[PDB]
Amino acid sequence: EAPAAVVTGAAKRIGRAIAVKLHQTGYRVVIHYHNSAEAAVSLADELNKERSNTAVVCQADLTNSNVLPASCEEIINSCFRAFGRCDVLVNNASAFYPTPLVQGKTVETQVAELIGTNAIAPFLLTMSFAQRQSNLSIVNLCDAMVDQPCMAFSLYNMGKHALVGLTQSAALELAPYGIRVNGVAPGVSLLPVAMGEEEKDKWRRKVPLGRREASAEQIADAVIFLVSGSAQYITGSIIKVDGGLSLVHA
Amino acid sequence: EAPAAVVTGAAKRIGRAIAVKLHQTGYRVVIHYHNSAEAAVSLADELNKERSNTAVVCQADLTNSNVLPASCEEIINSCFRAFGRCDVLVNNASAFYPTPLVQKTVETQVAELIGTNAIAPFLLTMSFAQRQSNLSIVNLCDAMVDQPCMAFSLYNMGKHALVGLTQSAALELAPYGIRVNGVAPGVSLLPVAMGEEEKDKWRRKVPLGRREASAEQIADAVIFLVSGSAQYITGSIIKVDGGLSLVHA
Amino acid sequence: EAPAAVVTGAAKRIGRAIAVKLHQTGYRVVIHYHNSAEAAVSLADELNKERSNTAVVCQADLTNSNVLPASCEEIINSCFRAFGRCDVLVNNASAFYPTPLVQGKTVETQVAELIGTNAIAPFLLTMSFAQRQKSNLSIVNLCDAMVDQPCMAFSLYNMGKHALVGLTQSAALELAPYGIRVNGVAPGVSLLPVAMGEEEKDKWRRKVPLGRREASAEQIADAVIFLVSGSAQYITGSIIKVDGGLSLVHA
Amino acid sequence: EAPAAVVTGAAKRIGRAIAVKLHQTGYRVVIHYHNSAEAAVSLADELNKERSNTAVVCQADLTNSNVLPASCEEIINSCFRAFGRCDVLVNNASAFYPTPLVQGKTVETQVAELIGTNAIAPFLLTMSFAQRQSNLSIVNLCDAMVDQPCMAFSLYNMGKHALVGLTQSAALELAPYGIRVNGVAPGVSLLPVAMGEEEKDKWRRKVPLGRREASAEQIADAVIFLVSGSAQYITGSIIKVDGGLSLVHA
Ligand SMILES: NC(=O)c1ccc[n+]([C@@H]2O[C@H](COP(=O)([O-])OP(=O)(O)OC[C@H]3O[C@@H](n4cnc5c(N)ncnc54)[C@H](OP(=O)(O)O)[C@@H]3O)[C@@H](O)[C@H]2O)c1
Ligand SMILES: NC(=O)c1ccc[n+]([C@@H]2O[C@H](COP(=O)([O-])OP(=O)(O)OC[C@H]3O[C@@H](n4cnc5c(N)ncnc54)[C@H](OP(=O)(O)O)[C@@H]3O)[C@@H](O)[C@H]2O)c1
Ligand SMILES: NC(=O)c1ccc[n+]([C@@H]2O[C@H](COP(=O)([O-])OP(=O)(O)OC[C@H]3O[C@@H](n4cnc5c(N)ncnc54)[C@H](OP(=O)(O)O)[C@@H]3O)[C@@H](O)[C@H]2O)c1
Ligand SMILES: NC(=O)c1ccc[n+]([C@@H]2O[C@H](COP(=O)([O-])OP(=O)(O)OC[C@H]3O[C@@H](n4cnc5c(N)ncnc54)[C@H](OP(=O)(O)O)[C@@H]3O)[C@@H](O)[C@H]2O)c1
Ligand SMILES: COc1cc(NCc2ccc3[nH+]c(N)nc(N)c3c2C)cc(OC)c1OC
Ligand SMILES: COc1cc(NCc2ccc3[nH+]c(N)nc(N)c3c2C)cc(OC)c1OC
Ligand SMILES: COc1cc(NCc2ccc3[nH+]c(N)nc(N)c3c2C)cc(OC)c1OC
Ligand SMILES: COc1cc(NCc2ccc3[nH+]c(N)nc(N)c3c2C)cc(OC)c1OC
């Protein structure tokens, strides 16, 4: 029987690359998405064309709220419903936007989105994954630049730091169950659709190893390593995949 | 005119020692409290007996909610109302209890643990900066964030987030001359709520004297960071842990 | 045409497992050794039985001295003489013993051995490796997951391993324009000494959250193989803990 | 009655400022120096004019060699010879220059100077200080930029990383003797005339807090705190005094 994985925010970009590589490795996949329904369905269609009945989509908002625990439980339930097991959880979904300290969304909403997606949803997903339970593991998508953060991104940075804390705490606590918990920390990988080429190039020029951003596949490669049998003693580790960006002084 | 400081969770224990030392150093102080009204007022009475009209109290729940931003704005406003200025913010108040991953609702635990340790510090930081000399913020962190207590994930998440706030706010508020630093205790003032067996077990782990920190020793590092002797220091977290975090399993 | 790797301290234990896995992956290997000649040669003979002319040995003391730079240049040169190329360097060789700060080796010898093997030799080997490269080139340094929670009375050892982290970062930064990646693997508790009492071994094993056991040499080698692979080609300046969670455990 | 301190590389710049502040605080001081004999003797004269018999100079090369242990023992011995006690050791002396990995000093000399001054001499001085033994402590001058080093400074950076390791290891091991071991990590401070004006200006503009370097006195202020009674539970801590420099991404 093939193992099964949940990847959050998997419709596009890094999440899609992770889902694709897991699928190529032989996993059945739950493609979680929030707004990108067409892209999620397009991906699931492609994966099911390769191997029938090996991909499903699952919609959920991962903003913090009193129903978030139930939503996260349902994402894990959806993997069991489709595939009868859940071996791997990848916490990839993430809100990212500035929240300046000095001056449409209310600050309450910004907290709920930035802390919810980057930290609280991963925590609740981790609880539900563990409660339901071989090579079991969780991979959290972190950020290599958390100690040298983008200016005016405090709430986002708080969220990613909290995710490091979760990775460590959950690795410690879930080790007796044989559930490994690790992270992959990109530097600059895919730049946003909205960003102009000149701004993209400004970031690219900072990277020592090739003056280019990580491909989505390069990020996925590290995730696949951590979920593999080649990482079976690794827990509580966060692997930077940043081309040396974090080593470069101001 | 004397500078003024807000200390959250200042009625007891480390917060109280911080408020006392700031006041002894010459600050006027806002003593924030949640449940400990009697102790907050007793502290204010003590400090005001030393110097009239130099200590006030301010009540607020720092749990995350729809009203937390307003509560935090009002804590900062209370300092400006009482004293006409706010030079120092100490983010000390903190919920701390286990939240096991496998088996209050969990969402209430998120609100309390992440609210007190991270979101309230952020909102207080925003309000402090917006309302603006030796201005600074000190966040009470945790020397054991990378070797956390078992089954304290949400607490540990909150303290990690507070490290991130310390760094992000240091970076962003530096142009305004506002420094942002942290003090990271190991074990300090182990409470009655711990058993004597657990208390001795922790104390014996501490390389420097096999004892916990006093609240005053924690306060000493806060006083340094707000002082003129720290005017180039921002984004720094000082462990006050007697070497505890250096000790392997 | 097959790539080539130098592994220092490759006769036994973790270095041996790394050399074996690299060879299984398709590398030709230089098996460096200091005192363990019989084991280095037995490994080479095993690997050459698998594929002829794919393993050589190279003897050197990696203690710090005025001749260390020449010794390290010669190790790298040996790979070029054997195989015509040198694609991977693994800095594994390491002295490890206590050096108490307070009350038969002299302290200058302990400095030389502990700082030489763990830090200075890796630096000189890195220099020589890079100079010959003035494709998937990379260096892997064997670090230590417990450098911030060190064994009592191991100051010089711990200094050496911290220095090795600094080399990893500095060399990653500087060698990036040459396409040479520089990374680390940081064991927690892996192979214990055979002569250590099982009761003492078990004291260490019981500390490890993930399985209450030490890492095998092969599990350490798995992380090295990942870092030198095509699946790690954007990774430089990273140190992967392979510690079963040990470093997360408070006192 | 008055406690005594050894400060290495104390003739000039940051070491001088540390020696002056310790002296103003009530310490008797050993002013160690290597080449700066005239400055060392002038400083001792200044401090002795303020309080007689409270300062001496001590010359030593702190380059690694087989005689370095004897030299370090002699520096501590010089404190006992002059003052009858040695309460504080400040490891400040430091060689700093590039050592590129790819191509008048030989590489062995570069290793000896950079690793000796920044790491091995601090270790040997720490040994001798501890063996010869209240508020006893050691302060190591570290570097806030150890994880974002200057390009082509590998040996220097290795030395400073080793000094972090010593700070931790010695804090752990010397705690039972009541000796605290801490560090102060500058970013940019008191940029020297020898540095080109253009390079000085470039580094100053990187610093978030005031777009300026630290004065020597600001560095010394952190050393004074760590040796004081207000730091009596602090050991194994390294305090950045960097104006936020280390927080700034490339
Ligand atoms: N790209 C980089 O340079 C970079 C750098 C450092 C770290 N990372 C990390 O790597 C991961 C992948 O990066 P990325 O650039 O591919 O991410 P991204 O495009 O910014 O976001 C990934 C997905 O997150 C989902 N998401 C956002 N808000 C959500 C919410 N409220 N509820 C549920 N899902 C939500 C979105 O799903 P829908 O589209 O379905 O709405 C989105 O497609 C993230 O964790 C990111 O922080 C990336
Ligand atoms: N003690 C230690 O060993 C230790 C170790 C590591 C870190 N620290 C950090 O050092 C700081 C001080 O420690 P401590 O032991 O003195 O703290 P504490 O006694 O656990 O808590 C301090 C105060 O926090 C306030 N607080 C708790 N929940 C709150 C809420 N929902 N809203 C508003 N205020 C709330 C309480 O105020 P009221 O009493 O008025 O309700 C309480 O008196 C904390 O940030 C702690 O995390 C302490
Ligand atoms: N084992 C663990 O639990 C553990 C934990 C943390 C980190 N590590 C790291 O992982 C690596 C491998 O560990 P290990 O236990 O396999 O190492 P090890 O057995 O202690 O030593 C490996 C080899 O180092 C060589 N070596 C020692 N001194 C030398 C010198 N002066 N010159 C040249 N070579 C010298 C020896 O080669 P010869 O036998 O030929 O003389 C020895 O076989 C080391 O870097 C170690 O620090 C291991
Ligand atoms: N300045 C900064 O921006 C900065 C930044 C980061 C870290 N730091 C650290 O802060 C400390 C003070 O910095 P600084 O700029 O004042 O240092 P510095 O001027 O570069 O050097 C301090 C003293 O080190 C002594 N020294 C050099 N080589 C020696 C040797 N072989 N043997 C004995 N002593 C030797 C010299 O003494 P003589 O003159 O008597 O020969 C020199 O005056 C150093 O540890 C430095 O690494 C400084
Ligand atoms: C510094 O400013 C910016 C930087 C970047 N960098 C690339 C980028 C893209 C998507 C991302 N998405 C998430 N989930 N998290 C990130 N960390 C992230 C990053 C790092 C993207 C921006 O646009 C969204 C931006 O704002 C203009
Ligand atoms: C592991 O279990 C426990 C550990 C401790 N340790 C001391 C202690 C006390 C108060 C604290 N209060 C806050 N805000 N944060 C902390 N970090 C903290 C700590 C660290 C105290 C306990 O009782 C309060 C306890 O539960 C029985
Ligand atoms: C703390 O005491 C000890 C601990 C260990 N632990 C396992 C072990 C074995 C070989 C090692 N070899 C090197 N190169 N570096 C290490 N880090 C290392 C370690 C970590 C091995 C000991 O004996 C060699 C020992 O001494 C009794
Ligand atoms: C990257 O190039 C350079 C950088 C700097 N930076 C300031 C500076 C000055 C003295 C220093 N001295 C020591 N002991 N350690 C340092 N860390 C140090 C630094 C950090 C100074 C230079 O000239 C003195 C220089 O060379 C041109």
mmCIF file of C-alpha atoms and ligand atoms in Angstrom, chain A residues 8-16 18 32-37 39-40 59-64 91-96 112-114 116-118 140-145 156 160 163 184-192 213-214 216 219, ligand 1:
data_model
loop_
_atom_site.group_PDB
_atom_site.id
_atom_site.type_symbol
_atom_site.label_atom_id
_atom_site.label_comp_id
_atom_site.label_asym_id
_atom_site.label_seq_id
_atom_site.Cartn_x
_atom_site.Cartn_y
_atom_site.Cartn_z
ATOM 1 C CA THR A 8 -1.077 22.597 2.828
ATOM 2 C CA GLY A 9 -1.245 25.417 0.317
ATOM 3 C CA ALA A 10 -0.411 22.927 -2.403
ATOM 4 C CA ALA A 11 -2.184 24.411 -5.440
ATOM 5 C CA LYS A 12 0.820 26.349 -6.736
ATOM 6 C CA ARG A 13 4.419 27.329 -6.309
ATOM 7 C CA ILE A 14 6.392 25.530 -3.572
ATOM 8 C CA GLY A 15 3.430 23.585 -2.211
ATOM 9 C CA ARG A 16 2.631 22.215 -5.662
ATOM 10 C CA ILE A 18 6.245 19.355 -2.862
ATOM 11 C CA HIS A 32 -5.039 21.496 0.472
ATOM 12 C CA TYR A 33 -5.943 24.964 -0.826
ATOM 13 C CA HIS A 34 -7.809 28.065 0.303
ATOM 14 C CA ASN A 35 -8.706 30.320 -2.639
ATOM 15 C CA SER A 36 -6.916 28.606 -5.561
ATOM 16 C CA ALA A 37 -9.589 26.070 -6.489
ATOM 17 C CA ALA A 39 -5.171 25.454 -9.706
ATOM 18 C CA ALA A 40 -5.725 22.754 -7.026
ATOM 19 C CA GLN A 59 -10.401 23.305 0.887
ATOM 20 C CA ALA A 60 -9.875 25.167 4.152
ATOM 21 C CA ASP A 61 -9.169 28.608 5.540
ATOM 22 C CA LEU A 62 -6.248 28.360 8.010
ATOM 23 C CA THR A 63 -6.828 31.808 9.543
ATOM 24 C CA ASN A 64 -7.003 31.564 13.341
ATOM 25 C CA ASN A 91 2.917 22.672 6.667
ATOM 26 C CA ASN A 92 3.491 24.955 3.679
ATOM 27 C CA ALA A 93 0.488 27.324 3.533
ATOM 28 C CA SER A 94 1.478 30.822 4.655
ATOM 29 C CA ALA A 95 0.242 34.395 4.635
ATOM 30 C CA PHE A 96 3.034 36.948 4.064
ATOM 31 C CA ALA A 112 -5.354 35.786 12.788
ATOM 32 C CA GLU A 113 -4.014 35.337 9.241
ATOM 33 C CA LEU A 114 -0.263 35.711 9.823
ATOM 34 C CA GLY A 116 -2.833 31.384 12.146
ATOM 35 C CA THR A 117 -1.346 30.220 8.867
ATOM 36 C CA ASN A 118 2.320 30.216 9.913
ATOM 37 C CA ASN A 140 7.343 22.632 8.386
ATOM 38 C CA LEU A 141 8.186 25.304 5.803
ATOM 39 C CA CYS A 142 10.191 27.815 7.779
ATOM 40 C CA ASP A 143 12.265 30.830 6.666
ATOM 41 C CA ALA A 144 16.062 31.084 6.595
ATOM 42 C CA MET A 145 15.844 34.840 7.184
ATOM 43 C CA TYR A 156 4.925 37.353 9.832
ATOM 44 C CA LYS A 160 7.762 31.882 11.522
ATOM 45 C CA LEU A 163 6.889 27.646 13.810
ATOM 46 C CA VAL A 184 12.938 23.357 5.480
ATOM 47 C CA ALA A 185 13.928 27.046 5.493
ATOM 48 C CA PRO A 186 14.008 28.781 2.108
ATOM 49 C CA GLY A 187 15.850 32.086 1.623
ATOM 50 C CA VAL A 188 14.554 33.494 -1.593
ATOM 51 C CA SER A 189 12.722 31.049 -3.771
ATOM 52 C CA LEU A 190 9.888 31.865 -6.157
ATOM 53 C CA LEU A 191 9.226 35.561 -6.208
ATOM 54 C CA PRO A 192 5.580 36.629 -6.189
ATOM 55 C CA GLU A 213 16.407 32.210 -6.347
ATOM 56 C CA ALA A 214 15.769 28.573 -5.389
ATOM 57 C CA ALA A 216 10.389 25.231 -6.290
ATOM 58 C CA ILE A 219 12.885 23.393 -1.939
HETATM 59 N N1 LIG E 1 8.876 32.081 -1.757
HETATM 60 C C1 LIG E 1 9.931 32.337 -0.985
HETATM 61 O O1 LIG E 1 10.948 33.042 -1.398
HETATM 62 C C2 LIG E 1 9.955 31.888 0.447
HETATM 63 C C3 LIG E 1 10.970 32.357 1.275
HETATM 64 C C4 LIG E 1 11.022 31.972 2.617
HETATM 65 C C5 LIG E 1 10.072 31.069 3.090
HETATM 66 N N2 LIG E 1 9.106 30.571 2.230
HETATM 67 C C6 LIG E 1 8.089 29.662 2.777
HETATM 68 O O2 LIG E 1 7.867 28.564 1.926
HETATM 69 C C7 LIG E 1 6.440 28.256 1.895
HETATM 70 C C8 LIG E 1 5.996 28.313 0.436
HETATM 71 O O3 LIG E 1 6.239 29.641 -0.089
HETATM 72 P P1 LIG E 1 5.381 30.181 -1.318
HETATM 73 O O4 LIG E 1 6.015 31.433 -1.776
HETATM 74 O O5 LIG E 1 5.137 29.085 -2.287
HETATM 75 O O6 LIG E 1 4.025 30.532 -0.525
HETATM 76 P P2 LIG E 1 2.842 31.516 -1.019
HETATM 77 O O7 LIG E 1 2.678 31.412 -2.484
HETATM 78 O O8 LIG E 1 3.003 32.851 -0.430
HETATM 79 O O9 LIG E 1 1.614 30.910 -0.217
HETATM 80 C C9 LIG E 1 1.331 29.523 -0.362
HETATM 81 C C10 LIG E 1 -0.145 29.223 -0.198
HETATM 82 O O10 LIG E 1 -0.540 29.623 1.136
HETATM 83 C C11 LIG E 1 -1.909 29.527 1.163
HETATM 84 N N3 LIG E 1 -2.527 30.403 2.175
HETATM 85 C C12 LIG E 1 -2.349 31.724 2.363
HETATM 86 N N4 LIG E 1 -3.205 32.177 3.286
HETATM 87 C C13 LIG E 1 -3.975 31.131 3.661
HETATM 88 C C14 LIG E 1 -5.052 30.991 4.548
HETATM 89 N N5 LIG E 1 -5.578 32.022 5.236
HETATM 90 N N6 LIG E 1 -5.593 29.764 4.666
HETATM 91 C C15 LIG E 1 -5.114 28.715 3.968
HETATM 92 N N7 LIG E 1 -4.109 28.807 3.106
HETATM 93 C C16 LIG E 1 -3.542 30.010 2.948
HETATM 94 C C17 LIG E 1 -2.371 30.046 -0.253
HETATM 95 O O11 LIG E 1 -3.340 29.133 -0.792
HETATM 96 P P3 LIG E 1 -4.410 29.520 -1.941
HETATM 97 O O12 LIG E 1 -3.545 30.045 -3.137
HETATM 98 O O13 LIG E 1 -5.159 28.270 -2.219
HETATM 99 O O14 LIG E 1 -5.331 30.628 -1.367
HETATM 100 C C18 LIG E 1 -1.074 30.031 -1.069
HETATM 101 O O15 LIG E 1 -1.182 29.429 -2.374
HETATM 102 C C19 LIG E 1 5.756 29.255 2.841
HETATM 103 O O16 LIG E 1 5.601 28.696 4.144
HETATM 104 C C20 LIG E 1 6.743 30.397 2.871
HETATM 105 O O17 LIG E 1 6.654 31.157 4.070
HETATM 106 C C21 LIG E 1 9.035 30.982 0.920
#
